[PDB]
Amino acid sequence: YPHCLQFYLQPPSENISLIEFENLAIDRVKLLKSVENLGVSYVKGTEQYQSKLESELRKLKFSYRENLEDEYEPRRRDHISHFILRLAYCQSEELRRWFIQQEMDLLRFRFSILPKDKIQDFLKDSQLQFEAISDEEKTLREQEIVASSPSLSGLKLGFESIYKIPFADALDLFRGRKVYLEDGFAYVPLKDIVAIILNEFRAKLSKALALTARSLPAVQSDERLQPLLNHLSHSYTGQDYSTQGNVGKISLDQIDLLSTKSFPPCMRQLHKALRENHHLRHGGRMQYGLFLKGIGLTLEQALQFWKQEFIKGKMDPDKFDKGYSYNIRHSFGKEGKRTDYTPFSCLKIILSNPPSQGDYHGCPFRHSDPELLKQKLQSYKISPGGISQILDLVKGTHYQVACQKYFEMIHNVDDCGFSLNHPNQFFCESQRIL
Template structure:
């Protein structure tokens, strides 16, 4: 399915396969039902990048649902994510608009491949994609939105004036609007109606917003979007089932399967960027080995704090615990020289000779100074969630609920977390939204810094990386300290 140049061509059916694969794809509208797959060549890198950027948005949408955000809050957070990762402008050069819509188109189809594998993944993907479509629909230019609707056959039947007059009393009874009767009737008189089978608008039937007659639902124009949203969901559900049946053909491609496996984990803990922040950049001073104890108490997420406490208790960590915690400290700003000092003092029950022979090489290796000299990144929440036992994974997933609550109180009670906060965290963990639980803990333990519920690390963004948690905590602390020093000077 890939050519020797590592380019991929998607073919759906025989008719589409006849389209010249190098011909440009036109996207006249921001809104898209994704009827046709991309028929052009893409590199493996573009294949993955487009999907990841889209997945960041969908993962944040699911996190928002788990956090019970209001519709307006959800739109704000999602629009911010779209601006950062998947902008779809309404104005600009034709080349810019085509490029943005091409990326949107490609990312959607790649994620179809990743999320068509099980009923649960398909359900979550449909819900997130439908929410994204609805947000775009609500924010779209009125004229362009109407052009998009006119370009598709939604199989609705316009209700003429005679039929509207015939059922005026019934239609008016279900018409929502102003409490002022004369104002409501005036708005009703100018409203257009459409007939569809009642099964296509179950949400409107449930809320009694439509008049039902002989199996038909009379939908007012202002509720027309309900038909569009339902059509989008039904269309996507059928497409995912079709994709699932075709997916086994990809098993032979060793380059695609690992990418799709990784993408399918995206709802588990969001999609982090490769974290590049450092403690030095935040604090202005290099992090020293003797500072780690204090930093752990003030700023570390539960996963890294647990590793640190285990290290202090046992004077040792198992291999993967050392690897994960060491990379975390490296990205936090601990230099290789200070890292060697930190680990040597931590392993104070072994001889220098044993430390140098069995541990020092691995420390230098993680900093890219030995072996293949790679610059290893710190593990993200997603990687910790999918890793093994609790001594180096995510406590929210691997700890029992009883142990988790005990760990939270013993770790964060001095930061304002109380037993009254635990039921909300436990409920989120039971629902499988582990990174959302971690985000709530961050908000609760940083309320004294002005962090409010729903804000996350800023702008509503959830925690998706341990270093993101620590860096934001250190940043807030520095701002507070600078403010206090400024007040003393004044």
């Protein structure tokens, strides 16, 4: 929205704090993930896409007020965050492709925001030399320009600017006879112009990432930056909310209703297994116990629930006290953290602890077979068109997007108004609508 449209070169030489470093990295990761989610769920030409993208930009403080020349806060934020994430995403080729694809969507959106006035100044100032034509030359060669133009309908050479460029830089256009040439200059409208800018940006970004990947071992020795390079998408989400504590009051006899109405497919499947077989494996026990702790259950209530469910399995109550009470009290209590104290997130469920025979944990859209997935979803009273859309998104590895559509369909809303990244957050947002 400001003059933040910039080709990302000339790495910064400023110095900053650790907290600013990590906040910038997290904010840029969140913005890129939001761009991907918007591109997958929507298209690149609707008002919803632009509105949500600009709302994300405004919330993350990437386009805001000005200051005295040097310290324009959103410009500094954008520059430093981009060059920080280059290090994190330069390692692997797949990560490089992801980073390049997501970074160009933001550039395209920023270019679309600008009015037809500032883009000329941006082009002239950007690299070294770029120029357009005035009204006299535009009208003098109008017929030739429209004749040489692509299948663009009509003779309406409207108010859209037409730019003259060296023919070589327009190679991808003039090799197929789609532009007008005169004295080695090609006349090109805005669409092909932005295509050219995207192509050059992709080339430069790929080259810069490839060069950066070489000098990566010189920085792997820093212990402060270890959670940056390797652990930006490992098990901890971009920005998670549901932790221990909070406020909540949920009865014990109401769990059955919430299993059908509120619980996500994975948690409801675990609940069905627990209520049917009266026993769960270690992964299922840990996952469901952490989930139940997250929703607001207390130590006494959880102990009573697990004991009552396990006694129905014909075991000794003293055996439960000596075998399973310790684990629950340790989960609800003090240190021994980071694996027994925070409820599992969507990324941890998907990318860690794959299930096997006898294990019912994991994400149904990720681990369960597609045929079993359809068989499951048919039991939830899901419309066949929604089933087809969910299966289509599952193919493109958009499991969380499929769950977003699941929530929107089951709770009868057009848009959930958020991006889900945690089953406990799914439950909380289902309770909010009620």
